[PDB]
Ligand binder design. Structure first.
Ligand SMILES: COc1ccccc1-c1noc(C)c1C(=O)N1CCN(c2ccc([N+](=O)[O-])cc2Cl)CC1
Ligand SMILES: COc1ccccc1-c1noc(C)c1C(=O)N1CCN(c2ccc([N+](=O)[O-])cc2Cl)CC1
Lengths: 423, 430, 430
């Protein structure tokens, strides 16, 4: 729909306008405005100013009116770091004015999903997994685990199965009954098999101990094979949108999507910068940000490499640390470098997780192939299903990548043939 | 060095300010201002001013539209001076001229101009700055190839200010030749009263010699004004940082720049990119091997490029025009040279031009025929000198390409090895 | 065009009828009649008639048997005339001769014949139709290469009907040369009274010139009689459809034909196929690059072919002979030309023969040495003309190959590029 495309374009324009004004207030250069470290701080300032939970607390426990973070300028051939303090009310004022008077929570949530996609690409969260009571190897089900509980509509769709499992277990271990039933429906709406979905209803209609806890732990384990419906959104740093709005792109009129070609197109026409530590490889910094930009942290490295063009190395062999720079780090040795965020191909982001056999005619040495899942499928059932599926079963049949010039999904390109957090 | 960087950084800063000022006057978006076609028209207007106009392209209602607006030359002349802190600033003007010249050198073969002058059309590589006007700047004089100089001199041969202009050009050409013998011939052309056919025949001889005993011709990375303007707008100070046309600066600038181009239906945007990349680094007549190595992707001959010229004529319809990012970046960088390579010295040789059979095995027995047979007044001295030279001889010893992070050129990469851009045509397969 | 197609279609139709008639007389099966060895003997008999015989091969009891039968020349002569609707039909006879000539041109190097005539044995490419008799047909005269003509003329030099035959041959040779200078030399050889050593030395000079300033020699796709006979039998009317030796017709005929050959123990049937394919399209002295491209598979040099001649001598035993399909089809087709390529005009040049260094990088600096150095009565005029020519120069501009469904040659494919068939031997690696 043009309307869905226009309303999505409305919020990006809103982010864009806000970032522009924010950059002029801080008197940042266009290059400095496009430094991702500044973008993060600026993005962090808005979210802090609308953090109602924190703001209510600070009124109750008395500078609470001001919010800050590190900002980076190039002064006398060197990168300087500075802590800037800015009034929260004015930040909210700028946000509203940029979003045409509205408090647009969708735009804020959009910047939260971006930070979440960045965290998943940067850090493995094993410490949180063990403390809750689940396997540290369940990390591929942990998309959106750094997001808040009441995060909004888009935030709910982005969250993984294990994320929902962790949130529920923490409640079971601990008005709020309505939230428990609401969160169960979110979890249930992501399981594709009827066997998994029915098990959720048992854990939902209960007033919960070991048995319910063990159900969620089992249901999470099953999601490693019988995967859930997790939405994937391309959410870019605010500087990307700010720069495009500044250069004359109208996201409202042109429309926009987060699962289409649009973000790939935009990054092809973007130049984002990052600060780099003495012994870091810029190509690996670029890989990290690229993966975050498209929510590809838990993706197969081969399909990510095919889309990207260059090799997508796993995290353990990646010669870089996080994008953010700690307060104790020496700025005298900091250099700025371009982030290569382009791609050779593009592909649609998924919310998902004739002849069937062959009759031999010739007497030759070969395997005799057959589509097993379609032929064969014609608590107990969960184990029965998990045993059936094979690592070499094909999914998304017929679907492929596209050339950048192919604006519509006309001619797909199917590749011929993997863990980012591998041992 | 610091002083050269200062003045160079000053003129680019001027071109920058002018372009920003020019982009606001026309109410162009940032993207539109960074369309190469818009940049070329703006560059044209200020050169034509020293009424003026040309095509300006906008993105109207999802489609590219063409409008040819006009400006008073006086108003443009005022804008240029005032963007260049008062000064008339002729240097920045010839800088935009050399950029146009480099683009012409990459786009068009000028064989029709060569035959009229009685010159061999296979002298491409001698023709840098041939579309550049006679009596250009000093920067224009340095950039002009031997053949350009020869051509301009023949047009003279074919009011005694004609005499000094003839002698200045002889001196410009003389300063480019790297052997004494070639220089002595130019003196003989210069010292001549009432120049005619003898001097014409001498100049053609000198041009042929310059294909083997190559002359010193300057090479300057000169970019479209939008690249400079975009940099100034975004917070780069060329006066504080300085600038160089032959060092790393232009390579680094392009790496931090994004330029667009209008593309025709049957055109490959990568091939359009190669052409403008070549133009940007004055690389039309370079070895394709070295251009390819530096760029990181193959630099293909002119005849195998699915692209026409950058400019779009008023004849063709805009309804089918689309826009594309120009890929103008590089894997490595390399210093732009004034040198034509080794021409003399002949300090020994050191090499192997034949084999001695060790094994009783059937095969041919290779040897370098032209070199071995070669050993068996100022005109014949040149002949003997260019007969000694071999295509195999290595110039620029010890020099190499550099990583884009190697700002000070500390660590040269020497490459281990399709050479002629204008070699692949319907008449010749070179 | 229609008239040429009519008469050509008539003679092939005649050869066809003759072969069918000849195949019934010998009680050969269709397969056996389409064995190339059987076709060659039948073709031989009718040429020898104008007693005659030769080997005829049959499939007896699971094995190939050889029998040499005889026929009265008068009876064969009667069969030929009566298959050609009364007429003596000499044209169809020289057509079978040119086919034999083309096969000989592909099979044998005739260096022993060249040395006796005082000619350089490296003149292969000049020797089309050398095994063709002196005083062949007009079609035979057109097909003969420059070297063949030179060789035949020297044999004359080494009863005043000798005078006119000498002058006819000088005119045949003159009509083949494409430059005035070469033609003027032939006049000087012709106008000579009592020809001797001066004319011999002139003819060798003219032959050498024809390796660079190539002459106009005709090329005609001439197929074994079984191909024509098989087509007539199967319902093709060459008189109604017409026929062409230089257009698409023979390529299309071969595509709808299946010919067989006897193969020796150590022979590769694909290599046997290449040889007969080359012969069929008069391609012995073509560039292997163009032959390969047209055929669709690699056309390998003579010395790398694991095959002997097509004919099987009476010496060798039949017990080890097997039979194989000859692959005579093609990926594309192309018009057979009379032209020797560009020899003059010299309208400019347009190209690049050197580079100008842009980057300070270590490398050799390529240049076209022979071309650059080249610029530094009728005999020397030829020397100067062939000194100007380059191996790189492109002939047949705008012309290309065609798909087999492109009957009218509407859409030429120009190819983007091992050249000499007789280049790979024990004495030379060309
Ligand atoms: C079709 O061009 C335009 C289209 C729209 C606006 C300006 C131009 C334009 N005006 O001048 C030039 C030059 C232009 C150009 O070619 N651009 C700029 C915009 N680009 C882009 C494309 C898609 C997305 N997205 O998010 O889907 C984001 C972006 Cl930034 C594509 C490249
Ligand atoms: C050290 O960075 C800076 C350095 C100077 C100014 C701004 C920045 C800067 N401020 O914010 C970010 C982000 C920046 C950045 O990283 N840049 C911008 C300038 N760049 C550049 C480098 C060299 C040439 N030249 O022509 O030699 C041209 C250019 Cl455009 C290099 C990349």
């Amino acid at each position: 729909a043009t309307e869905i495309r226009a309303s999505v374009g409305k919020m990006i324009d809103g982010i864009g306008r806000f970032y522009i004004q924010m950059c002029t207030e801080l008197k940042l250069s266009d290059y400095e405005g496009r430094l991702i470290q500044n973008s993060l701080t600026i993005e962090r300032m808005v979210l802090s100013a609308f953090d109602e939970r924190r703001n209510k607390y600070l009124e109750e426990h008395p500078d609470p009116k001001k919010t800050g973070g590190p900002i980076y300028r190039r002064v006398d051939g060197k990168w300087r770091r500075e802590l800037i303090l800015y009034d929260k009310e004015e930040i909210r004022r700028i946000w509203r004015q940029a979003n045409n008077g509205d408090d647009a929570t969708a735009g804020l949530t959009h910047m939260m999903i971006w930070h979440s996609n960045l965290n998943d690409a940067t850090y493995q969260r094993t410490r949180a997994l063990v403390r809750t009571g689940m396997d540290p190897r369940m990390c591929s089900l942990m998309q959106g685990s750094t997001l808040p509980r009441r995060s909004g509509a888009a935030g709910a769709a982005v969250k993984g199965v294990g994320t929902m499992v962790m949130e529920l277990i923490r409640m079971i271990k601990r008005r709020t009954r309505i939230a428990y039933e609401r969160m169960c429906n979110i979890l249930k709406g992501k399981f594709q098999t009827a066997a998994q979905r029915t098990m959720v209803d048992q854990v939902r209609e209960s007033r919960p101990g070991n048995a319910e806890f063990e159900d969620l732990i089992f249901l999470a384990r099953s999601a490693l094979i019988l995967r859930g419906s997790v939405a994937h959104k391309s959410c870019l740093p605010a500087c990307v949108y700010g720069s495009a709005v500044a250069s004359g792109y109208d996201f409202e009129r042109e429309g926009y999507s987060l699962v289409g070609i649009d973000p790939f197109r935009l990054l092809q026409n973007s130049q984002v910068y990052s600060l780099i530590r003495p012994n870091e490889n810029p190509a690996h910094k670029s890989q990290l940000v690229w993966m975050a930009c498209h929510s590809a942290a838990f993706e197969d490295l081969r399909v990510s490499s095919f889309i990207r063009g260059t090799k997508v190395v796993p995290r353990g062999k990646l010669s870089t640390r996080g994008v953010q720079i700690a307060s104790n780090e020496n700025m005298e040795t900091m250099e700025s470098s371009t982030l290569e965020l382009r791609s050779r191909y593009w592909a649609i982001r998924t919310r998902s997780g004739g002849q069937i056999s062959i009759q031999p005619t010739f007497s030759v040495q070969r395997n005799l192939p057959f589509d097993r899942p379609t032929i064969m499928a014609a608590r107990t059932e969960i184990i029965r299903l998990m045993e059936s599926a094979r690592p070499e079963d094909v999914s998304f049949q017929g679907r492929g990548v596209f050339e950048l010039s192919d604006e519509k999904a006309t001619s797909p390109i199917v590749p011929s043939f993997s863990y980012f957090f591998g041992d």
